[PDB]
Design a protein around this ligand. Structure first.
Ligand SMILES: C[C@@H]1c2cc(O)ccc2O[C@@H](c2ccc(OCCN3CCCC3)cc2)[C@H]1c1ccc(O)cc1
Ligand SMILES: C[C@@H]1c2cc(O)ccc2O[C@@H](c2ccc(OCCN3CCCC3)cc2)[C@H]1c1ccc(O)cc1
Lengths: 245, 245
C-alpha cells in the first residue's frame, strides 16, 4: 500500500471481500414467531467473524500491532457492517437487504422499539449511494478507510511505537485516497469532478459514523449480547496461531 | 456560492466569523465554588446565539427554507461548537481554550463525571489540527461543510421543495470543495498533496461527528437545559423579522 500501485490496491481489496451470508431461520415456518432482533443479532455476529478475516487482508492492516488492530476494529465494526448493508441494499429501493433471504422495509423495523429511526437512516444512505451511482471499486476503498480511520484518533498513549503506528495508518489512508482519485480519473471524470466526488464520498462517512453511534446507543438499550468485553472476543479472533498454515 | 468565486467564498466565510466570547464568573472569587458545568453551559448557550448569525452569513444557507435551516442547525450545533473549540485550542497543547479566561487541561475535566473522556477526544483533535498545520482559511471551509452536511441526509420527506433543497446544498458543498482545493493550490501543494489533504481534512469531520454524538449522550445525562425543544428556540432565533433593518 506504500509501494503497491492503485491498481494493486483495488484488486487486493476486491479480492478481500467477505461473503454475503444468509439469515438462519426455517423458511417453512411463519414469520410472527421469529424474533427480528434475534435474526439480526445472529446475522451480525456471523458477519463479524468474516470481518476479521477481511481486515487482515486490507493492505497495511496486519503490519499494525495486535493491540492496534483490536482497537480499530472495536471502534469501526458497526460502521463496517452498516456500509456493507447499505451497499447491498442499493438496488432495492425502500428495502434493506440484511441477507438475500431477509429483505426488510421500514414498517418491518417498527416491530422493534426505536428501531425504525435507524432503518430510515440506513435507507437514506442507500438512496444516496444509488443517486451517486457508487461503484464497487469505490465502495471497497470507502470500507477500508473506515477501518483505518475511525479509531486512529483515540489511541490513548503516545509511545514511540504508537506514533509510528499513526504515521503508517495515515500513509495507507493517503494511498487509498490516491486509489479513489485514480479510479475516478480512469472513469473519465474531470479533475474538478474528481475532487468533488472525493468529498461527496468522504462526507458520507460522517453520516455512517452517526448511524453507528446511534445504533450503539440503541443496541445498548439491551436485548442482545454484551457478555464478555468486545475487546477480548476481537483479540481472540485476531490473535491467531500459524498452525493451520 | 454558485457564481461566487473561491476567493469570494473564502472572504465571505472569513467575514462571517463569530466573536470569541468570555466565560462569565467573577475573577476575584475562588474556583472551587464555580460549577464547571454551569460555566460551560452558559458559555455554549451564548455562542449559539452568535452561531445563528454566522450561519445566516454562510453562502447559500439563507436561500434555504426556514424549516431546513432549523433542521441543519439542530443537527450540527454541537459539532460546530466543538470544531471552534479545537481550533482556538490549537496553539495550547494539552489545554482546551473554552474562553480566553477559561483554559482547562484534562484533569480539570475529571471534575465532571464522564467528562474527561470528551476532553481527551477534543484534545486529540486539537493536536491533529496542530500536526496538520490547519490554516484559518481551511477551518472556515470545514465549519461551513459541517453546517450544510450534518443534517442533509435526514430530512424526512421528499417533497419537490425538499428535493430542490438537497440539490442546492450539495451544490454549495461542491463549491466549498472547489474552494479548499483552490487554497491548497495557491499554497503550492502538488495535485497529489491537494487531494490527500482534502481527504485528511474531511475524515476529521467524521471524528467531530463522533465527539458530538458522544457529547449529546453525555449532555443527556442531565444537569443542563432541555426545557423547550431545541427546534423551537432555534426557530425563534432564525425566524427573525426585518424591522430592525
Ligand atoms: C444495521 C445492523 C445490522 C447490519 C448487518 O450487516 C447485519 C445485521 C444487522 O442487524 C442489526 C444488528 C447489528 C449488530 C448487532 O450486534 C449484536 C451484538 N454483537 C456482539 C459482537 C458483534 C455484535 C445486533 C443487531 C442492525 C442494527 C439494528 C439496530 C441498531 O440499533 C443497530 C444495528
Ligand atoms: C465542548 C463543549 C463546549 C464547546 C464550546 O464551544 C463552549 C462550551 C462548551 O462546554 C460544554 C457544553 C456544550 C454544550 C452544552 O449545552 C448546554 C445546553 N444548551 C441548550 C441549547 C444549546 C446548548 C453544555 C456544555 C462542552 C461539552 C462538555 C461535555 C459534553 O458531554 C458535551 C459538550
Amino acid at each position: 500500500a506504500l509501494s503497491l500501485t492503485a491498481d494493486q490496491m483495488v484488486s487486493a481489496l476486491l479480492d478481500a471481500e467477505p461473503p454475503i451470508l444468509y439469515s438462519e431461520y426455517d423458511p417453512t415456518r411463519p414469520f410472527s414467531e421469529a424474533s427480528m432482533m434475534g435474526l439480526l443479532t445472529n446475522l451480525a455476529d456471523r458477519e463479524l467473524v468474516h470481518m476479521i478475516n477481511w481486515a487482515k487482508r486490507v493492505p497495511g492492516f496486519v503490519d499494525l500491532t495486535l493491540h492496534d488492530q483490536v482497537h480499530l476494529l472495536e471502534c469501526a465494526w458497526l460502521e463496517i457492517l452498516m456500509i456493507g448493508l447499505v451497499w447491498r441494499s442499493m438496488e432495492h429501493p425502500g428495502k434493506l437487504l440484511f441477507a438475500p433471504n431477509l429483505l426488510l422495509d421500514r414498517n418491518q423495523g417498527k416491530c422493534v422499539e426505536g428501531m425504525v429511526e435507524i432503518f430510515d437512516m440506513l435507507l437514506a444512505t442507500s438512496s444516496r449511494f444509488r443517486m451517486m451511482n457508487l461503484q464497487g471499486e469505490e465502495f471497497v476503498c470507502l470500507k477500508s478507510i473506515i477501518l483505518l480511520n475511525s479509531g486512529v484518533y483515540t489511541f490513548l498513549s503516545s509511545t514511540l511505537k504508537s506514533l509510528e503506528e499513526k504515521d503508517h495508518i495515515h500513509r495507507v489512508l493517503d494511498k487509498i485516497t490516491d486509489t479513489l482519485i485514480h479510479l475516478m480519473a480512469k472513469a473519465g471524470l474531470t479533475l474538478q469532478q474528481q475532487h468533488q466526488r472525493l468529498a461527496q464520498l468522504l462526507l458520507i462517512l460522517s453520516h455512517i459514523r452517526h448511524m453507528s453511534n446511534k445504533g450503539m446507543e440503541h443496541l445498548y438499550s439491551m436485548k442482545c449480547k454484551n457478555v464478555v468485553p468486545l475487546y477480548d472476543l476481537l483479540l481472540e479472533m485476531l490473535d491467531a496461531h500459524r498452525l493451520h498454515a
